Structure formats: structure tokens, C-alpha cells
Design a protein around this ligand. Structure first.
Ligand SMILES: [Mg+2]
Ligand SMILES: [Mg+2]
Ligand SMILES: [Mg+2]
Ligand SMILES: [Mg+2]
Ligand SMILES: [Mg+2]
Ligand SMILES: [Mg+2]
Ligand SMILES: [Mg+2]
Ligand SMILES: [Mg+2]
Ligand SMILES: [Mg+2]
Ligand SMILES: [Mg+2]
Ligand SMILES: [Mg+2]
Ligand SMILES: [Mg+2]
Ligand SMILES: [Mg+2]
Ligand SMILES: [Mg+2]
Ligand SMILES: [Mg+2]
Ligand SMILES: [Mg+2]
Lengths: 50, 273, 164, 205, 156
RNA sequence: AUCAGAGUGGCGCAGCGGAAGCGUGGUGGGCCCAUAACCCACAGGUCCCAGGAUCGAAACCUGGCUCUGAUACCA
RNA sequence: GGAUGCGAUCAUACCAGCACUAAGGCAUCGGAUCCCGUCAGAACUCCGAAGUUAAGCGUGCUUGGGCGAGAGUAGUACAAGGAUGGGUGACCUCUUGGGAAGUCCUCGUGUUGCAUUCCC
RNA sequence: UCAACGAGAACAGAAAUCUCGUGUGGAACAAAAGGGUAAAAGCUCGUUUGAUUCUGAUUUCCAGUACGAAUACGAACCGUG
RNA sequence: UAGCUGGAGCCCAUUACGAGUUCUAUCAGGUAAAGCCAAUGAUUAGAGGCAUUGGGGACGCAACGUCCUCGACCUAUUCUCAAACUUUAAAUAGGUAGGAUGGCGCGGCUGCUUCGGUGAGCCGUGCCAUGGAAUCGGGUGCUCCAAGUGGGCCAUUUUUG
């Protein structure tokens, strides 16, 4: 009758049955959000390669 | 006299503060490099005055400890010609000139940054003009009060004339008109050429010849009358810009003799009375 | 040690007057100390607003000015001449100093050239041996050794064999 | 008015001692913890005997004062007020609560009384006496152990009264004068401290 | 929000260690961080700018961004049935270099010299640590032997 | 049992931090032969008990006490 | 064996009481015209060398406080896992592993970076 | 450099103002409680408006949405030293 | 709505990539214990000294003196404690690393960065890298569409009233 319910019961069991999904390790880890001062320069340097 | 709980809950400050020689609030803000430069230290122009010397050092910080790359003391100016009154405003000027010239010569750009060959009262900015920017150092006064006319800023003008690039403003050079908010070139000229001492040598020699003798003993016996400061500092400037280059304490007595004395004192007290 | 660096000498006379009031009362309490010192005094505001004393908080209730040097000696000798060169063998403080209190006009100076009344006042002198800057400077400040801290027995031994 | 003490026997809740948060606590029944001559030094009473509880409970303040009075009346009538020292070795610092139309809406309760949390083999009472008279004190402790909820032993101590000393070792220190009598307790002298602070005949390696 | 502020439940989490309060040693400001290095986030109570949330304390991650006064740390947070690469910025006061990889790097270079040396000599080698295995047999020279027995129960 | 309200001069009561009063009552004169009454003066209080903040408390918050007033219903 | 300057580690470095120091340096120290500062040249600022190691700085001592380490506390307290283990119950035992802390006792009281400079 | 303590100074006392000594924070930081701070993050003084503009990024709650709050850069313009 | 589940698959694959696991290494904690002979708080009982006078008897003709007194106070102690106390500090669990997504050499770019080829990063090229602890194994690895569920209960241990 107590309308408020909250348990962590069964929660690890549900979590671990599709595994703890680690996202795929990627070559060229993303540069989103890095220092734009550094990113501008890196983009210019890739612009002027030979 | 202090309780055990005090001693046990005490936290000792850094040793360079228990000795009271360093301001760590200033030191962190001086040596904290931007982390995206990754090694480039900020070199500090550290100028210090003792009661009879003027130390000047271009130093940078490293985990093992600060590392000096060029030192200049006012007590080595007797090598260059200035023998007396080596802790005045012009003496710190010449110390700064000497240190700047030595740094520039060591880093092999002195020929390309000569600054003013002749000292000028007007505040100086050097040009980074072409392909090789000037050496850049940060002034590190230390614990002293940064007031107008300070010998730290005399050394600052010395280094600026010597060719270093030092962040600066002309609001604390000697002769700053704190009312009009601008320097006087002539007044700073006078100060960097020891004029503020020369006028007072005349001030004592005019009608107070006893205090004059008892006050300027070394000047008198080295024969520098008041009108012979100008060219003296001219020639020291030239010389500096020409050549910028057993048991007496007791040992700790050891364990053996320590308890050798302890047994003796113990027998003395327990047997006695 | 009989070392010619260990001589007593005044550091400062402090001349305070606790008036606990304000207005023309304390303005004249100030100008009188001006006549004594030759230097402009500073007003000492109140704390704790103790009512039974009739003092509000943060109101100027005293006026003091610090005198040091030959002027201090010249005014201290008159201050002792008030007490006929004799103190109570208890005015001396354990650390370095002693004091006493007088009534103004037995000092030097015609009285009502300012039209200011008699103001009592607590002389308080601090003795020192040369070298307290090692406890008062900004860089490398530390305690002064016992051998060159003046204490009571030296204050008496300074007061009675000499200067009277 | 008070509840039966069986309702507060097990230790079931973390300590709730009187503090900046537990206010309204009543005063405890016991207000004195030493009875007899609490003034004699160590050497008058060498015999020490302990009433030791053997189980975790909450011996209430009333229970543990009833114990002191039940041992003390006996001990004073029989061995006189000249030959025993009583000390209860437990303190009522734990605070009990009570919850007395309304259901358990807001079921936290105002404090009821005070009780002391005992341990497995925690000395609960101790008395010290002279060996000739130790029988009275031992049997008095037995007359007191019917005042406590759990089960207790009555163990003669190997220590000298209320000291931290074995009998042979304490008397040996008394012989060599390496011990100071401070009163109810004792102090060794040791190899620490400055020579000057020691008595001439009291400096040891 | 929703019942807890950032610095909830951190009475003893964020406090300085005993007698280590006050000035911050300069090595924490001199240690330089390069993108890829492993840093352990442990918050400093005093420096209230740039603190991470209380979860990231006591964890390890690779740097991903190095800025003036601020390090971009990158650590894995397990929520639900997946791992989030949380990318946070912390000031240098709050992070230290990780020594998880010091022994790996040392063993890297040690292995490389050994494999070069084996390449020079008879070209077979096994550069691996085996876990503590069975010990070989050996003789023990009979010494004075101390006989020990169960002790009788003293109620004292 | 909860929830309010109020504890201030001898009594009943006013009070908004600098901070204490109102009637009456009491004390001393005056009028009267004398007592009122009337006229003129005088002295008041543990601001319920114990804390804190506050320039500044009796007021502000809280804990403890005593009285009063409410609400305690569908079975 | 020193010292100064900038420092790293921030008590083995501090704290208390004491005894002592060669040259050098630090310091104390003299003065207040100037820049500068305050009620006050005490502080700070400028200028300077008559003297003093008296103080600081440094070294050393104390059956010192503190701190650091070690033994010990102690395989004790606790605690992951097992029992159709004991017990009326509280609790406890055995099995497979982990394993603390005070008091007490012994020892110790800094290591060092760079630039300059002093010794006998 | 604080709170406090110690010795002191006319009226001045337990408490008014001043001086010296000790002072690991026993004070203060608008408020609740915790944390933190001592040549400061406290007290006094000078100068000020970064309590500004443009849009993103991240953390906290989170479904890894929003809001609030915070953090780190970027491009401007400035404050102070 | 996320989760848990099915269906459709697709992508690769025994090279690798992983793991509700252990080992080696290295971080972080403030719970059990423990502590008060350490801070905050609570607290029992004595011992010894001491006040520039907390107060009284007696001497104090007199004080810049004491003999008792309740006792402040100080000193070393001592019995017992703390979820909203803690110096210390477990066990259990927690994070990260254990290579082929590495390293070095050479010459190129940078509008960033430095006093500066000084760094930081990238680009082209050439070399090396015995597979870099144990054990086990194909994988949500990627995606889509969607069902039901969103009233729970019992037990051992920790645990609130
Ligand atoms: Mg529900
Ligand atoms: Mg500064
Ligand atoms: Mg919400
Ligand atoms: Mg929540
Ligand atoms: Mg909500
Ligand atoms: Mg912690
Ligand atoms: Mg907690
Ligand atoms: Mg009448
Ligand atoms: Mg009448
Ligand atoms: Mg400041
Ligand atoms: Mg958001
Ligand atoms: Mg769904
Ligand atoms: Mg516990
Ligand atoms: Mg402990
Ligand atoms: Mg305690
Ligand atoms: Mg681990």
C-alpha cells in the first residue's frame, strides 16, 4: 500500500546479462571538445602538407 | 611552555617560510606555466639586495630545485671600475645591465639586441623585430614593498636597457610623478647616474663637513667628489657592455659517548644527596 | 655580557588618555597631545559597547600618539619629574616596559593657550636593547634571544643606577 | 511506569548518547560510582575481585545501582566501613527510546531512560579489600549478581587493587623502589624524562 | 539537483590528510601532462576551482586535452548496462601522474633489449612473467628444532 | 495526545532591539478635630527558567516549566 | 668545514631550555637631503660603513616535549567465504583465507638541487 | 594577524584606551551544517565593475533530455598589479 | 521513457578482441576495530602543588604574610564512552596498466608554442617489435521493429523505526 518503492535488487542481474557494454576502442580517438587553439593549428598543419 | 597537545597537533609551515625568505603565494603564480606548453619554464629575473650586495639571477624552476643560468652581483663591479657605493640606485642599474648583457651573450643574441648603448631616463621597450624575439623574463621582487624609486626598479631599468624583454610598466621607476602620472626623463637620468647621491654629497659638504666625512668615508678616500659620478657611471656602463663575464663546529657526539655521559650524570645524581 | 652592543635605550613613549567621550572634549584631548608631541595624534575607537561605561561601539573614545627619539627622552624626563623620579617597584612589566600616569599641567606649556582643561594621561615607555629589528622586520623575523631581551631586573637596573 | 527491562536487553541500535542532538534525556538512577573508602592508597587493599558480565546486554542504570547498594549494605554491615572499596566499572552512556489513535506515523520516539552497554568479559564491578577479609567482598559480589540480567563470573584478579600490576611484579617494584604510590594507582619510574625531575634515589636505566 | 548537491556526502572525502593542510607543494604544479598519460584523479579540498564531481575521486584515466591550468581527464563510468567515457576537465591540483604504467614501461624496454640480444645470439627467447609457481625440491640441513605444543587454559 | 495563546510593579495590564510604563496599590508630607476623599512629592520590577545570534534583548530563534483555549471524526 | 641568493622534500626539518663559533657572507648598525611612508625614518623607502658578534642566522647538548622508524600489542580485535556446527538465546567454535590500532620497550633528530663565494 | 591568555599604565574596577610577550586558528569569512583558508580566502587601505559581450563544450540530476548551478578552453573588450 | 526479452538480420572472426575471475604493479577510501595515557564533546575518583587576594575562622598593632576551610586553577594520573568525534586504521568490495591502436630513425607542415628546432601535434617514408601474466571463450560487434513488465515476496549476513 506504501506507494513508494525503490530497490537495487535484480539490477546487477539485469545489467550483466547483456554484459557491461564497453564502447569499442577506436583508433583516432575523437577530438571533439579539445582546445580549439590546438585544433585550429592542427587543421592548418594538415592543410599545408606536401 | 607549550602543551603536548599543541606540539602534537602542530603543522609546520614550509621551511622557506619558517625562515621567512619566500612568499609562496607569489612563487606559485610566478612559476605556474600554462600546462599546454609542457616544459617551457618562466625564467625569473630575481633581484635581491642585502645590506652590502645586490644579487641578480635569471633562474627557472624544476622539481629538483631552481636552476640558475646567469648570476650578477654588485660586489663584482670592482672588477669593472665601480668600487664604492655599490648598493645605490645606479649600482642596481648597473647590476641589471651586467646581468642582461651576460644573459644575452650566453644565449647568443646580444649582437642582435643591444638596447640603448647609452642609459636613458625614458622607459624602454625593445623590438622583437625580426625572426628572433628577445629573451623574456619575469621580475621577482621577493618580500620587499614595491614603492616608487625602488632599487628593484633600478635593476629593472638596467635589464631593460641591457636588452631583456621584461613585463613592466613605468609606474614605479624613480622620478614617477605620482601626481601627474608620468615620469621625468631627467629625474630618472639623475637617479640612474647616481645624481641623487651626488646632490647629497654636496648637501653635506656645503655646511656640514663633519657629518660628510663621517658619512662618506669610502668615497672620500677613493677620491670621488660629487661632480665625478657622471663619467664614472659612463665608463662603468662601457666596461660592463664590453666584458659581460677545517673543523670549527662540534661533531654530533655518538651513541657511545652519549650514554657514557648519561651514566656519569646518573651516578652523580643518584649517589649525591 | 658587557658587550658594547647591549645597552638599554627607549624604543617609544606612548602617551594615551582614556576619556571615553567625544566631541570638543576629545578634540581638545587631541590638541593637547599635539602640544606635547609635536606630531598629529590618532583617535582610538571603542569596542564592545559596554553600557555601564557610557561608550558606544566604534566611537572614538581615546587619543594616543607615539613619541620616540630625543623628543621622547625630553618628554619622559619631565614625566618622571612629575613622579619625582621614583616609581612603585611594580609599574614595570615583566617583558620590557613600564608605565605610570600623571596630570597634565605639571608638564611644560602654558595651560590655556588652547583653552583645554587638565587631562590626566598614562605615560608608557618600552625599553629595548639594540637589535629588536630582528623581531620587527618583514623578511626573516624571529624571536630575540633572552640575553638581549630587556626584562624587569634590567629595567630597574637601568632606572635607578642611571637616568636619575 | 518504566517498561520491563527485558524489552531493552539485546544491543540492536547504534549508540544514541546524550549530545547536541539527543535532548530531553532524563537523569540516570546512579549518580555515584565509588563507595567505601575511595581514599586509601594502593598498599592498604591488595585483594581485588571482579564481577564480570559474560553476555552483551544493556544493564540499565537502575540495575547497576541496585547492584552497588545490594553489595554495599552487605559489605558495610559485615566488614564495616573500614575495609572495602567499591567501584562500578561501567557507565550508563547509552540512551533508550520509547514510542507511546496514531499508528506508526512518525514512529521515532522520545527518550525513556539510560542503560550501559556491556561486553563479553567486560568487568562490571570491582571491589578491593585486604586478603584476610576478601571472603565478605566475594560473597557480596555474589549477592549482587542476582541484580543483573545476564550471567556473570566472579573472578579474583591477579592485579594489585585497581592497578595494572601483577602481584609479584608490583611487590618487586615496591622492593626495589622503582614505583611511586600516587594513591589509588601507581606509577613506574623509567628511562625517560630529564634527570633533574627525578628524586635522588629514584633514577633508573 | 534531485536531492543531492555536487559536494554531498564528502565530509571525509574532500578533507586534507591530517597535518597536510595549507600550502600546496610546487611539484604538483611542475608535473607536466602529455595527451595519453595516465593520471589518477584525487580532489584537493582547498582548490575550489575546477573540482571534479565527487565520483571521479580515486580513479584513473588517460589525459585527452591539456589546456592552460586545466587537464582533460577521460575516465570510464559504469551506469546501467554500459560504460561511458566521461571526459572531464580538472585543474592540475586535483590530478597526479599514475604509476600503473611505470612498471609496464620499464618492462617494455627491458623486454626489447633482451629480444634484441636473443636476436643476436641463439634466436629463441620467452619474455613473459609467469605467476608464482611450484617451488622445486631441496634439502634442509637439520638444525635445532623447537618443539611447540598446545597450551593449557589459564582462566586469568 | 497533538496545536495555538499568554507568562512584565503589590494586582490587572501596555510595550516596534537606544533600554520600562499605565491605572491602582504602597511610602512622606498637605487639608480635617480624626478617617476617607482631594492636593503635592517618593520608591518600584529576578520583564516565566536556561542558552545563542545581534552595534544593541524583555522582545529575535531555541530548549525547560505553568495555566488557558481548540481538535480528537466514519466505523 | 661555511655562507649568501633562488629552491626541492615540508617537524628525523618543529617546539622548549641552554653552551659555543675561525675567514667570508648574512646580520646587527649610522643617518633622514632625496624617491618613498607612517601618528611615529619603529615598519617600509633612500643613503652609508664607526662598532659589534649581543641578538638573529648556524652548530652542538638534554635519561626533554613532538615527530620518523623498528620490535611489540598480535595472529589478539575485526572481517570475505562454508557448516543439517554448538547454544534456549545472546553469542561462540571449527574449516578455507585477509589481518589492525593505543599504552609499554629500543633507535634516530634531516636529505639535497643550481649560481656565487670563504677557508688553510 | 586573528580568539584567548600573561604582565603591565590617572581616574579605570570582572569589563572602556594603550604597550610588550605567547598565540596551528581555539577568531572571521551575510546566513544553516560540513569542508577550506594565516605575508589568506580573514582585518584595513588604494583603484575598480569579469555581476561585461558571442555562441558552443563538459560535470552534477540524468533516460546520460531539459532547467538551475558549476567548470575548462576559444574570439572580443576591460579591471587591477 | 530507459532497463530486461523476442524477431529480422548484417558485420566480421579464430589471426585477434574480450571476461560478473585470479596474479604482478600502482592508486583512492574512513567502515569494523581502535583512541582519549591525542583534538571536539561526555564523564568517574583520588594524589601533589599553586594563587598578585574566588570567598571565611586565627594571628594578622602591620603588610610587598600565613595554619585550617569549601574550593577555583595547574600538574602527572585514573574508571567509562561517541551515528551526526577523531590522530591511526582493517577485511570485503573499487579504479587503472600488463604491446602489433608500440617504439626508433630520416625529412616535411603549423595561422599554435618557444629567447631559439625550443616544444606540442600532425604528415610522408624506412626500419625494428618471439605476441609480452594465469585461465577461459566467438562476439551487441553494429543496427532496426517490437512484446510484456513497471503491485513483488522469502532467506543468510550488514542495517534503519
Ligand atoms: Mg510501486
Ligand atoms: Mg605580493
Ligand atoms: Mg528536478
Ligand atoms: Mg537520486
Ligand atoms: Mg523530480
Ligand atoms: Mg579521508
Ligand atoms: Mg561517512
Ligand atoms: Mg500616606
Ligand atoms: Mg486624611
Ligand atoms: Mg594578500
Ligand atoms: Mg546540461
Ligand atoms: Mg519500452
Ligand atoms: Mg566503532
Ligand atoms: Mg586508534
Ligand atoms: Mg577525548
Ligand atoms: Mg585493487
Amino acid at each position: 500500500a506504501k506507494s513508494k518503492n525503490h530497490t537495487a535488487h535484480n539490477q546487477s542481474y539485469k545489467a550483466h546479462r547483456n554484459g557491461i557494454k564497453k564502447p569499442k576502442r577506436q583508433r583516432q580517438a575523437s577530438t571533439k571538445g579539445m582546445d580549439p587553439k590546438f585544433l585550429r593549428n592542427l587543421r592548418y598543419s594538415r592543410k599545408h602538407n606536401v | 611552555q607549550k602543551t603536548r597537545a599543541y606540539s602534537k597537533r602542530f603543522q609546520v609551515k614550509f621551511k622557506r617560510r619558517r625562515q621567512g625568505k619566500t612568499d609562496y603565494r607569489a612563487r606559485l603564480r610566478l612559476t605556474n606555466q600554462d600546462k599546454n606548453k609542457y616544459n617551457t619554464p618562466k625564467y625569473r629575473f630575481v633581484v635581491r639586495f642585502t645590506n652590502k650586495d645586490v644579487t641578480a639571477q635569471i633562474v627557472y624552476a624544476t622539481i629538483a630545485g631552481d636552476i640558475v643560468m646567469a648570476a650578477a652581483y654588485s660586489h663584482e663591479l670592482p672588477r669593472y671600475g665601480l668600487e664604492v657605493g655599490l648598493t645605490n640606485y645606479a649600482a642596481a642599474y648597473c647590476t641589471g645591465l651586467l646581468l642582461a648583457r651576460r644573459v644575452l651573450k650566453c644565449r647568443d643574441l646580444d649582437q642582435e639586441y643591444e638596447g640603448n648603448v647609452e642609459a636613458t631616463g625614458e622607459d624602454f621597450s625593445v623590438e622583437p623585430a625580426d625572426e628572433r624575439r628577445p629573451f623574456r623574463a619575469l621580475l621577482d621582487v621577493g618580500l620587499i614593498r614595491t614603492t616608487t624609486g625602488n632599487r628593484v626598479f633600478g635593476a629593472l631599468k638596467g635589464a631593460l636597457d641591457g636588452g631583456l624583454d621584461i613585463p613592466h610598466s613605468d609606474k614605479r621607476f624613480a622620478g614617477f610623478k605620482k601626481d601627474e602620472k608620468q615620469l621625468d626623463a631627467e629625474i630618472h637620468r639623475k637617479y640612474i647616474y647616481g645624481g641623487h647621491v651626488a646632490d647629497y654629497m654636496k648637501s653635506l659638504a656645503d655646511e656640514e663637513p663633519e657629518k660628510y666625512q663621517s658619512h662618506f668615508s669610502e668615497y672620500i678616500k677613493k677620491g670621488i667628489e660629487a661632480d665625478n659620478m657622471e663619467a664614472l657611471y659612463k665608463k662603468v656602463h662601457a666596461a660592463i657592455r664590453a666584458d659581460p663575464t677545517k673543523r670549527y663546529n662540534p661533531k654530533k657526539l655518538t651513541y657511545e659517548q652519549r650514554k657514557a655521559s648519561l651514566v656519569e650524570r646518573l651516578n652523580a645524581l643518584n649517589s649525591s644527596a | 655580557q658587557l658587550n658594547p652592543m647591549r645597552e638599554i635605550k627607549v624604543q617609544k613613549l606612548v602617551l594615551n588618555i582614556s576619556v571615553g567621550e567625544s566631541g570638543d572634549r576629545l578634540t581638545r584631548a587631541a590638541k593637547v597631545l599635539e602640544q606635547l608631541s609635536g606630531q598629529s595624534p590618532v583617535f582610538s575607537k571603542a569596542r564592545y559597547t559596554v553600557r555601564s561605561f557610557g561608550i558606544r561601539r566604534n566611537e572614538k573614545i581615546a587619543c594616543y600618539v607615539t613619541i620616540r627619539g630625543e623628543k621622547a627622552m625630553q618628554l619622559l624626563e619631565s614625566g618622571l619629574k612629575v613622579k619625582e623620579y621614583e616609581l612603585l617597584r611594580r609599574n614595570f612589566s615583566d617583558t620590557g616596559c613600564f608605565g605610570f600616569g600623571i596630570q597634565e599641567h605639571i608638564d611644560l606649556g602654558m595651560k590655556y593657550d588652547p583653552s583645554t582643561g587638565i587631562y590626566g594621561m598614562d605615560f608608557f615607555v618600552v625599553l629595548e636593547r639594540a637589535g629588536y629589528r630582528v623581531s620587527r622586520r618583514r623578511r626573516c623575523k624571529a624571536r630575540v634571544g633572552i640575553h638581549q631581551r630587556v626584562t624587569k631586573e634590567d629595567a630597574m637596573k637601568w632606572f635607578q643606577v642611571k637616568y636619575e | 511506569g518504566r517498561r520491563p527491562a527485558r524489552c531493552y536487553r539485546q544491543i540492536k541500535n547504534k549508540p544514541y548518547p546524550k549530545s547536541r542532538y539527543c535532548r530531553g534525556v532524563p537523569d540516570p538512577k546512579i549518580r555515584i560510582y565509588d563507595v567505601g573508602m575511595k581514599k586509601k592508597g594502593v598498599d592498604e587493599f591488595p585483594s581485588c575481585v571482579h564481577l564480570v558480565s559474560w553476555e552483551k546486554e544493556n544493564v540499565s542504570s537502575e540495575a547497576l545501582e541496585a547492584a552497588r547498594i545490594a553489595c554495599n549494605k552487605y559489605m558495610t554491615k559485615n566488614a564495616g566501613k573500614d575495609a572495602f572499596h567499591l567501584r562500578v566499572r561501567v557507565h550508563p552512556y547509552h540512551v533508550l527510546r520509547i514510542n507511546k489513535q496514531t499508528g506508526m506515523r512518525g514512529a521515532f520516539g522520545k527518550p525513556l531512560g539510560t542503560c550501559a552497554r556491556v561486553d563479553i568479559g567486560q568487568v562490571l564491578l570491582s571491589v578491593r579489600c585486604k586478603e584476610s577479609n576478601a571472603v565478605h567482598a566475594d560473597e557480596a559480589l555474589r549477592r549482587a549478581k542476582f541484580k543483573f540480567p545476564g550471567r556473570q563470573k566472579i573472578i579474583r584478579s591477579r592485579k594489585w587493587g585497581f592497578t595494572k600490576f601483577n602481584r609479584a611484579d608490583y611487590i618487586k617494584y615496591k622492593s626495589e623502589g622503582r614505583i611511586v604510590p600516587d594513591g589509588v594507582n601507581a606509577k613506574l619510574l623509567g628511562v625517560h624524562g630529564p634527570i633533574a625531575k627525578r628524586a635522588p634515589g629514584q633514577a633508573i636505566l | 539537483p534531485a536531492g543531492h548537491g555536487l559536494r554531498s556526502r564528502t565530509r571525509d572525502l574532500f578533507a586534507r590528510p591530517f597535518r597536510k593542510k595549507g600550502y600546496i607543494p610546487l611539484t604538483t604544479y611542475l608535473r607536466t601532462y602529455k595527451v595519453g598519460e595516465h593520471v589518477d584523479v584525487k580532489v584537493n579540498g582547498a582548490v575550489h576551482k575546477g573540482m571534479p564531481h565527487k565520483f571521479y575521486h580515486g580513479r584513473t584515466g588517460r589525459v585527452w586535452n591539456v589546456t592552460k591550468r586545466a587537464i582533460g581527464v577521460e575516465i570510464n563510468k559504469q551506469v546501467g548496462n554500459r560504460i561511458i567515457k566521461k571526459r572531464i576537465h580538472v585543474r592540475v591540483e586535483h590530478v597526479q601522474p599514475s604509476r600503473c604504467n611505470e612498471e609496464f614501461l620499464q618492462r617494455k624496454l627491458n623486454n626489447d633489449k633482451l629480444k634484441a640480444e636473443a636476436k643476436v645470439r641463439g634466436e629463441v627467447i620467452s619474455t613473459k612473467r609467469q605467476p608464482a609457481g611450484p617451488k622445486p625440491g631441496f634439502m634442509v640441513e637439520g638444525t635445532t628444532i623447537e618443539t611447540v605444543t598446545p597450551i593449557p587454559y589459564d582462566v586469568v
